[PDB]
């Protein structure tokens, strides 16, 4: 073989370069996987116009049945409050998420009126372009102090709060372990981001542990990818669809065991749970710093339009420049912000109203127990819980119709109830039809007993 090498070295350069390009040609041919036919056909212009004229588009909106219950809207002839007027009939409000009863507090109205005289109704611009008022900064500081956190950010719409907070931190290729029975806002937030969603059973830490261990195995498969993948656990403090609280301590321990941050939704528990109404964290005593991001809205308890997210500056300062509902939308009107600030002052002044709400929820939950055709779904500490059908028929339409018949009978009996509404096609895990019951510090004990008796008799009559 040495003689061959010597002869090749004695060969001219052009011969060797030609042989090299020939070898490259051989490689190209051997790796020419695609097979071609040299057959090209182009459509004739007449055929193209025939296709253009033939095509007929579907109608923009499909024909809607006239039997849809959601088509009929309840018309309230006045402010939605205790002793309201629904459909021209006087009723007691058991359907509106106003727990603390701050909607009609005269101090809130006075503060809103003062700020309305000072600033007006509209802000007329995003937060970047002359849309930031001093009331917005005051409200953000008030929220930060009240929640014992470093920073808070306020959005002008409750849905947008979480639907824009979640996509900001979660990107494509990440892992999100979200509870199964999570509200539509969280579902749309998770759809906006393109990360991989893992769903676990409602309040089952066994399933969370199992999923985390499976992800740990997959990380052991490839360390380089596992170095650049982030893991989040999105849970709600007091669930909307189910009405059950979440077990924080186990979640926190799993966080510190498996290196996955926690996003908490506190729309329902922000102003009802804990001694001072700081949410589920105070109710459990877990430290505020353990949870990365805590979201809520100012609409249920504080009785004003908006929402907010709170946490350390490290996580919050990102939303100011990456949140869609924040960067590309007008800011909250000043009067709503002033109403929120006054409501915060009232909440901080006397913290016994949380205890009053707790005792009234206990009374109504105890009284309601005993319905033959309806089962109570929720927990004793929840202000809003569900009444579901004990014996479910074959189809959902009949269940909805029976529940609506019960609701109408109750409404004619001076108790105002609403049924939980969902998008049937869109919801991932679609809850069973249920009657929503909401408890307020405004309702006295006697009205609670009367409402229990009324719904009891109506259910017994209708189901039989």
């Amino acid at each position: 073989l040495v003689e061959m090498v010597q002869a090749l070295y004695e060969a001219p350069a052009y011969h060797l370069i030609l042989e090299g390009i020939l070898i490259l040609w051989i490689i190209r041919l051997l790796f020419s996987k695609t097979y071609k036919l040299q057959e090209r056909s182009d459509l004739t212009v007449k055929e193209k116009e025939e296709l253009i004229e033939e095509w007929q588009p579907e109608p923009l909106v499909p024909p809607v049945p006239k039997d849809h219950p959601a088509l009929n809207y309840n018309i309230v002839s006045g402010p939605p409050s205790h002793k309201t007027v629904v459909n021209g009939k006087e009723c007691i409000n058991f359907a509106s998420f106003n727990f603390l009863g701050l909607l009609d507090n005269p101090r809130v109205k006075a503060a809103a009126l003062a700020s309305l005289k000072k600033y007006g109704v509209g802000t007329c611009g995003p937060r970047g372009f002359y849309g930031t008022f001093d009331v917005h900064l005051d409200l953000e500081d008030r929220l930060a102090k009240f929640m014992k956190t470093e920073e808070a950010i306020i959005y002008s719409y409750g849905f947008a709060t979480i639907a824009s907070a979640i996509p900001a931190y979660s990107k494509r290729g990440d892992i999100v372990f979200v509870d199964r029975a999570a509200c539509f806002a969280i579902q749309k937030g998770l759809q906006a981001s393109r990360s991989d969603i893992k769903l676990f059973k409602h309040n089952d830490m066994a399933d969370l542990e199992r999923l985390l261990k499976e992800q740990e195995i997959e990380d052991q498969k490839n360390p380089r990818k596992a170095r650049v993948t982030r893991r989040f656990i999105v849970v709600e403090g007091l669930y909307m669809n189910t009405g059950t609280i979440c077990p924080l301590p186990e979640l926190v321990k799993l966080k510190y065991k498996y290196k996955a941050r926690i996003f908490l939704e506190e729309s329902l528990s922000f102003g009802v749970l804990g001694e001072h109404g700081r949410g589920v964290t105070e109710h459990y005593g877990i430290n505020i710093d353990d949870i990365d991001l805590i979201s809520a809205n100012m609409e249920n308890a504080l009785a004003s339009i908006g929402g907010f997210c709170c946490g350390r500056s490290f996580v919050i300062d990102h939303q100011r420049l990456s949140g869609q509902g924040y960067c590309f939308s007008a800011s909250l009107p000043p009067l709503l912000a002033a109403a929120a600030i006054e409501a915060l002052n009232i909440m901080e002044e006397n913290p016994g109203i949380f205890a009053v709400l707790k005792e009234k929820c206990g009374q109504i939950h105890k009284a309601l127990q005993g319905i033959s055709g309806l089962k109570v779904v929720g927990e004793s500490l929840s202000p809003a819980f569900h009444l579901q059908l004990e014996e479910s028929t074959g189809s959902r339409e009949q269940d909805v119709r029976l529940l609506q018949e019960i609701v109408d009978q109750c409404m004619n009996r001076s108790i105002a109830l609403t049924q939980a509404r969902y998008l049937e096609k869109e919801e991932k895990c679609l809850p069973p039809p249920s009657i929503r019951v909401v408890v307020t510090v405004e309702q006295t004990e006697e009205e609670l007993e009367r409402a229990a008796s009324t719904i009891k008799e109506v259910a017994q009559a209708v189901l039989l």
């Binding site: 018309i75 109704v121 007329c124 930031t132 947008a160 009067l335």
Partner: protein, 492 residues
């Protein structure tokens, strides 16, 4: 498409030397940003940033550092232009709280004094309805005293009220469509009503300069999205033809639907959509039209009926008409108008209809009062003088600015006036020198725009008198001389 009126617009191209100097500036900024990152990497220079808590150092880093490059190196240097707090009604004159920074804009602190009587060119009050003292404020206060501020339930549940029905009837009469619906956020309108109309297997032809709400709404739905050039009717026609002819990409089936998303007036560019061409192509190819009228619902038209009134078209031609009350009417909200079947289907199958709270009661009263004032139901000549005044202000401002030698984008009848600066340092320079002369403007930089095109947008109003416009024009001319911002070849 026939234009009953002349359609004049001028988008002059950038001078060549100006482009070269722009790239020089951006290269210098990039190199010094890399240098600063290296210095901070080895802790040679202390960094004024928050860091993750000590318990979580084991966790994977939350952010990727390279994504924040232009935030640390370019945005921080001129951060003082944006997020300017105000403490007054955003009228023609606004009061700006003054702040100072000694850490090169990393941290801000508020001085005691407040700047007073700043001419406001950044706010959106086209018709000048942002007044703290007026009939609309009296009506809003009257409703606020009784109804309270805020409703605590969804529309499908007890949260529905009579005020919302009254507002919907008023809006339906205003636009001229059969029916309309009102939402509590302009962003939410698009983001939660575009997915309902169009789903997977359909096509959404989107303009090149759509708002972020329209893009997000299209992205949430599973439809296929194609983008045509900005007001390039040839490109729209070509995409329509190819979409109808070649069918779906993977499996050559006909599309279920074709939806065209367009806006009335584009904010940053300043152009007005070529509506007659779009309507003609929509009729020819049997597509559907979504018209976003956030900017044109109050500013444009002899009576402020919209852009369809401006062009003289029939409102029944456009399938979906979205709009926002934030810009012109002075109250936060949104709406969608169309045929009755559309509105019924949306009332039944809309995300914000089922899952989100309805509008506030005082806000709907302010909208009702302002819209009645524009209609003329009040009977006072006020509200009709506002449109004439806005048209005169736009004509005067645009002509005077164009005859000084500046470069201005957009149509001749669009209240938004973009003035081009073309350089990164001139953004901060223009902002600071304008505030120093008591004028508030909005400057827009690179990542938002093309690289060569950095601008400053003026939003005119009917609240602006002639003296205010003359003062603003004189100061703008002086600053243009100072910074050499007159890059117009035709005039100077």
């Amino acid at each position: 498409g026939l234009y009953k009126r002349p359609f004049n617009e001028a988008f002059e191209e950038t001078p060549m030397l100006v482009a070269v100097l722009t790239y020089v500036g951006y290269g210098v900024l990039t190199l010094f940003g890399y240098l600063r990152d290296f210095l901070r990497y080895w802790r040679i220079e202390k960094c004024h940033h928050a860091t993750e808590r000590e318990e979580q150092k084991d966790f994977v880093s939350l952010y990727q550092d390279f994504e924040n490059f232009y935030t640390r190196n370019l945005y921080m240097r001129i951060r003082d232009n944006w997020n300017r707090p105000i403490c007054s009604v955003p009228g023609a004159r606004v009061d700006i709280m003054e702040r100072q920074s000694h850490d090169y804009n990393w941290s801000f602190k508020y001085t005691g004094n407040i700047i007073k009587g700043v001419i406001n060119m950044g706010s959106y009050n086209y018709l000048g309805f942002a007044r703290n003292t007026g009939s609309c404020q009296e009506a809003a206060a009257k409703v606020l005293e009784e109804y309270g501020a805020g409703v605590c339930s969804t529309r499908q549940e007890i949260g529905n009220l009579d005020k919302h029905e009254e507002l919907e009837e008023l809006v339906a009469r205003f636009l001229g469509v059969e029916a309309a619906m009102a939402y509590g956020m302009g962003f939410a309108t698009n983001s939660m009503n575009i997915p309902a109309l169009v789903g997977k297997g359909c096509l959404i032809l989107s303009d090149e300069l759509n708002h972020a709400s329209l893009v997000l709404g299209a992205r949430l739905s599973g439809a296929t999205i194609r983008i045509f050039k900005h007001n390039n009717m040839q490109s729209l026609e070509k995409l329509l033809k190819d979409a109808i002819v070649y069918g779906q990409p993977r499996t050559r089936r006909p599309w279920k639907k074709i939806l065209i998303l367009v806006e009335g007036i584009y904010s940053m560019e300043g152009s007005i959509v070529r509506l007659p061409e779009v309507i003609a192509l929509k009729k020819k190819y049997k597509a559907y039209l979504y018209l976003d009228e956030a900017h044109s619902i109050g500013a444009l038209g002899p009576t402020g009926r919209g852009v369809v009134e401006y062009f003289g078209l029939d409102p029944e031609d456009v399938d979906v008409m979205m709009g926002t009350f934030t810009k012109s009417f002075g109250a936060s909200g949104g709406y969608i108008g169309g045929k009755k079947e559309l509105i019924d289907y949306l009332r039944t199958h809309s995300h914000s209809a089922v899952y989100a709270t309805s509008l506030s009661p005082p806000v709907v009263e302010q909208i009702i009062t302002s819209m009645k004032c524009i209609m003329g139901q009040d009977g006072t000549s006020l509200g009709k003088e506002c449109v004439q005044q806005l048209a005169e202000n736009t004509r005067y401002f645009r002509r005077r600015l164009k005859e000084m030698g500046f470069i201005i984008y957009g149509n001749e009848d669009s209240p938004v006036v973009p003035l081009m600066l073309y350089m990164p340092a001139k953004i901060g320079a223009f902002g600071r020198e304008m505030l120093k002369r008591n004028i508030g403007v909005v400057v827009v930089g690179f990542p938002a725009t093309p690289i060569i095109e950095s601008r400053a947008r003026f939003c005119l109003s009917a609240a602006h008198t002639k003296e205010i416009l003359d003062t603003a024009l004189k100061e703008i001319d002086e600053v243009g001389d100072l910074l050499q911002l007159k890059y117009s070849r035709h005039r100077l």
